[PDB]
Amino acid sequence: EEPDREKIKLLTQATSEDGTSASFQIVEEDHTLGNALRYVIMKNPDVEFCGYSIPHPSENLLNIRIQTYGETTAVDALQKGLKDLMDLCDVVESKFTEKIKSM
Amino acid sequence: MIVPVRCFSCGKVVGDKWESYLNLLQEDELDEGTALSRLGLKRYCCRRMILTHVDLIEKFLRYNPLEKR
Amino acid sequence: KSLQYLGSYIARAKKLSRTQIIFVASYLTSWLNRYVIEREEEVDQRGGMERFKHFYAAFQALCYIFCFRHNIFRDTDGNWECELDKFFQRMVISKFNPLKFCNENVMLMFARIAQQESVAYCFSIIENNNNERTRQQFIDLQSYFPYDPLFLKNYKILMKEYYIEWS
Amino acid sequence: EWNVEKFKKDFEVNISSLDAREANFDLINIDTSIANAFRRIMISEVPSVAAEYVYFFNNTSVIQDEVLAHRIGLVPLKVDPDMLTWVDSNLPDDEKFTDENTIVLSLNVKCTRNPDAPSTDPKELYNNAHVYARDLKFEPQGRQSTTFADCPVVPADPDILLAKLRPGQEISLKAHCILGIGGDHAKFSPVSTASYRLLPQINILQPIKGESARRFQKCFPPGVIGIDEGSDEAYVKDARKDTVSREVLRYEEFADKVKLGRVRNHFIFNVESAGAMTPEEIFFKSVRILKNKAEYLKNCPITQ
Amino acid sequence: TLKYICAECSSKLSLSRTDAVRCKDCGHRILLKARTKRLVQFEAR
Numbered sequence: 157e158e159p160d161r162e163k164i165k166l167l168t169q170a171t172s173e174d175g176t177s178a179s180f181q182i183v184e185e186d187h188t189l190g191n192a193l194r195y196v197i198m199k200n201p202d203v204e205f206c207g208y209s210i211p212h213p214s215e216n217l218l219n220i221r222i223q224t225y226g227e228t229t230a231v232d233a234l235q236k237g238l239k240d241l242m243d244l245c246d247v248v249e250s251k252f253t254e255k256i257k258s259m
Numbered sequence: 260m261i262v263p264v265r266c267f268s269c270g271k272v273v274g275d276k277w278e279s280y281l282n283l284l285q286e287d288e289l290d291e292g293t294a295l296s297r298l299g300l301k302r303y304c305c306r307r308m309i310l311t312h313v314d315l316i317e318k319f320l321r322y323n324p325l326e327k328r
Numbered sequence: 329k330s331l332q333y334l335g336s337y338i339a340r341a342k343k344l345s346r347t348q349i350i351f352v353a354s355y356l357t358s359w360l361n362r363y364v365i366e367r368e369e370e371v372d373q374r375g376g377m378e379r380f381k382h383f384y385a386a387f388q389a390l391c392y393i394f395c396f397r398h399n400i401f402r403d404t405d406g407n408w409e410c411e412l413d414k415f416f417q418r419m420v421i422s423k424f425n426p427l428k429f430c431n432e433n434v435m436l437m438f439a440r441i442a443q444q445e446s447v448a449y450c451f452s453i454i455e456n457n458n459n460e461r462t463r464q465q466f467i468d469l470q471s472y473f474p475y476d477p478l479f480l481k482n483y484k485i486l487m488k489e490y491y492i493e494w495s
Numbered sequence: 496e497w498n499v500e501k502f503k504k505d506f507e508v509n510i511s512s513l514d515a516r517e518a519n520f521d522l523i524n525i526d527t528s529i530a531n532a533f534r535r536i537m538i539s540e541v542p543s544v545a546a547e548y549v550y551f552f553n554n555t556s557v558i559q560d561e562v563l564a565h566r567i568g569l570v571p572l573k574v575d576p577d578m579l580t581w582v583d584s585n586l587p588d589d590e591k592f593t594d595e596n597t598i599v600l601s602l603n604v605k606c607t608r609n610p611d612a613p614s615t616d617p618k619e620l621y622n623n624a625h626v627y628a629r630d631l632k633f634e635p636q637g638r639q640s641t642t643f644a645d646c647p648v649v650p651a652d653p654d655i656l657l658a659k660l661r662p663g664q665e666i667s668l669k670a671h672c673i674l675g676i677g678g679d680h681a682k683f684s685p686v687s688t689a690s691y692r693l694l695p696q697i698n699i700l701q702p703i704k705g706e707s708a709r710r711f712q713k714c715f716p717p718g719v720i721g722i723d724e725g726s727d728e729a730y731v732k733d734a735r736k737d738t739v740s741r742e743v744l745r746y747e748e749f750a751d752k753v754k755l756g757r758v759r760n761h762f763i764f765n766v767e768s769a770g771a772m773t774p775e776e777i778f779f780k781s782v783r784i785l786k787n788k789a790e791y792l793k794n795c796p797i798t799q
Numbered sequence: 800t801l802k803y804i805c806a807e808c809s810s811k812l813s814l815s816r817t818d819a820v821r822c823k824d825c826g827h828r829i830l831l832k833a834r835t836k837r838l839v840q841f842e843a844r
Contacts, residue, residue, distance in 0.1 A: 159798075163792065199497040249779065259510065
């Protein structure tokens with residue numbers, strides 16, 4: 157089993173050991189996932205702050221920040237931000253196949 | 260030079276329609292815009308590639324360095 | 329590095345006395361309990377866990393004594409030197425979690441020995457690291473065991489008499 | 496309060512028209528952040544087959560080496576992906592093209608003068624003066640004697656004008672192909688125009704019947720406003736027939752009797768095609784690439 | 800075979816050494832080189 161640990165990196169120069177405040181540095185990304193992920197995280201009511209910022213468009217990096225009220229870390233809020241965006245891309249597709257077949 | 264393959268802004272393949280305006284005026288014998296309307300002519304974000312193109316490759320080919328005369 | 333040099337020295341040496349082993353670990357438990365009064369309530373102030381780099385590398389090097397030299401510590405009855413199911417069993421559940429900040433390999437060796445030796449029960453707490461889990465050059469010292477076996481085929485013929493293997 | 500169950504009960508898709516090139520389907524009650532990303536992926540991230548490395552063994556005509564090398568890469572090849580696989584540039588030249596990663600093309604044309612009498616049609620006047628795209632011939636490399644037998648690699652519009660020649664001249668080449676993202680170069684782009692437009696909404700305030708209603712008809716696209724009489728004065732037929740010209744918002748009579756807005760979740764995707772794939776299928780590729788991009792972060796552990 | 804091109808009459812004539820730099824089907828002086836089948840490679844960018 158071979159992990160690919162380039163794609164996530166929690167910047168510990170911005171993360172408290174409370175876990176409720178952290179800062180993820182994604183690589184190989186852009187506005188494509190970022191706004192789409194951030195919209196999903198902002199529906200979890202325990203998320204007090206969530207925004208993305210591309211640092212510079214020349215290199216393909218990505219920084220998002222998540223702050224929570226407590227009782228959920230940034231990582232337990234990041235995964236549910238990704239766990240729903242999986243399902244939200246299936247509710248689109250399954251609704252979409254059912255409309256092709258009626259023509 | 261020759262007609263570009265792809266529309267620059269939009270991206271539709273435009274190596275297709277360069278050839279119907281003699282026959283629009285010899286076989287169809289119209290005026291300009293009536294012949295500039297029918298045959299699949301649709302978007303003035305790429306309808307330019309009819310009006311705008313020059314096709315300077317015809318002026319080069321008369322300078323063949325490989326044929327007698 | 330010296331404590332890292334010291335930790336893989338004892339358990340990778342065939343020819344020592346069986347009381348030279350003790351005084352090293354006697355002092356090395358003495359320092360960790362000279363450590364209790366001062367910096368074991370300074371934890372929760374505004375800082376980092378990298379303040380105590382000197383501590384966890386020592387407790388790593390102390391765990392590597394017990395990993396491949398534990399039966400020497402066995403007395404007549406089966407008790408331990410200064411009750412190592414009270415010394416370690418405090419520092420298993422201390423306010424550092426030194427089970428987390430030492431090396432992952434040698435702490436895995438510890439609970440997969442302390443299960444079959446009944447000194448600690450820290451496999452639960454290593455399992456209890458789910459969501460919470462200058463670092464890259466701090467891994468690299470904790471994996472530098474200086475007394476690994478020699479791969480070269482010719483000089484270990486001399487060192488087949490002075491050295492304990494992975495067995 | 497948002498939950499993904501609640502997204503499912505008010506998300507709709509209206510596939511209005513679906514052609515083999517240019518599909519046009521509506522959406523309901525999805526946020527713009529998701530709906531741009533579907534536009535975002537269909538241009539960049541859906542991969543496609545394109546010519547990459549062009550080996551000219553002989554180029555003699557007037558169109559130069561590097562120009563015609565550029566045009567062949569633009570040629571949309573009617574071959575579905577998930578037949579090839581990617582290249583991997585961490586290994587040298589003789590290992591980089593296999594039977595599995597590279598459609599191999601070649602083109603050989605010589606022109607010579609045909610005896611004809613004239614003021615002369617330059618097809619009749621020279622043999623093979625036009626080099627169309629349908630002269631690019633697939634060469635089967637490796638195991639490609641039956642795995643591309645049903646679908647030989649055909650340029651999706653075989654009438655692309657690659658070159659013009661004269662007698663004496665020739666172009667003798669060999670062009671490899673590859674599978675790649677559109678985010679690198681603009682020849683891998685699997686779509687002509689991936690676009691969504693946001694549905695206009697027109698709000699009238701007063702009754703604007705009568706003679707005025709005829710000047711509310713004509714200040715729009717014609718299939719938008721319908722008049723009957725003062726009975727059924729001026730109803731909105733189609734808010735989709737109208738695009739935003741705002742011709743009505745420069746008049747005095749309708750300076751305030753009508754307002755214009757956008758329905759801020761009802762998208763109208765238009766998805767044209769590149770000729771390689773059906774347009775509804777590349778929309779299926781986009782909605783799973785984002786799911787391929789969603790799982791892959793979840794399947795990635797946080798080290799430092 | 801290495802040959803060249805007469806610029807004037809368009810007749811492909813080769814050139815050995817200790818020879819006139821001339822055409823021989825016409826009588827022309829300035830004379831240009833043709834190409835043969837040789838591998839050159841390009842990116843399609």
